[PDB]
Amino acid sequence: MNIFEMLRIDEGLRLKIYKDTEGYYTIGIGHLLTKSPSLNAAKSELDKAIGRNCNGVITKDEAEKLFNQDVDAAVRGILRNAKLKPVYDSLDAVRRCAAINMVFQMGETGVAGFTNSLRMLQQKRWDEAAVNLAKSRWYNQTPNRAKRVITTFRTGTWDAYK
Numbered sequence: 001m002n003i004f005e006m007l008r009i010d011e012g013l014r015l016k017i018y019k020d021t022e023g024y025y026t027i028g029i030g031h032l033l034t035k036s037p038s039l040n041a042a043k044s045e046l047d048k049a050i051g052r053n054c055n056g057v058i059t060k061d062e063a064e065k066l067f068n069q070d071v072d073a074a075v076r077g078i079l080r081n082a083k084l085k086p087v088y089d090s091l092d093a094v095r096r097c098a099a100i101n102m103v104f105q106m107g108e109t110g111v112a113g114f115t116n117s118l119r120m121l122q123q124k125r126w127d128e129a130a131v132n133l134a135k136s137r138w139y140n141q142t143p144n145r146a147k148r149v150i151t152t153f154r155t156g157t158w159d160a161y162k
């Protein structure tokens, strides 16, 4: 298991514009296009991202290239953020994947607000961090996704994904 397989399981793959759990236009492996309610705005964002006139549909190769860019961007966002980087650098490789997963889903800004969880993770207080992570809108709105990610932080294993 690696971060790409983990996120592919959590996000799935759709080659036509779809709406995510919050109602936002998305494509591929969880690539957010826009928060605007306008499908035309989403189609324009897609064409800009891919570099051709897509009319709302992409190929599998295009979806996988966008996915690679999005994972790269999530990692860079962690490494540039003075609050996230020290915690990330303190984690083992499996728990680092759980960190990237959260940033991919919620953004650098959203995860950086989980201040109390971050401190517990840096101190390696895994059970306490798991309870704190679950006291969140995130857990209440996407509980199965959140349970898999939290279990990965708690155990440092891939067992939730196997």
Ligand SMILES: CCc1ccccc1
Residues within 6 Å of the ligand: 078, 084, 085, 087, 088, 098, 099, 100, 102, 103, 111, 114, 117, 118, 121
């Ligand atoms: C709150 C999970 C996390 C930890 C470290 C870095 C990013 C995200």
Ligand SMILES: [Cl-]
Residues within 6 Å of the ligand: 141, 142, 143, 144, 145, 146
């Ligand atoms: Cl869920």
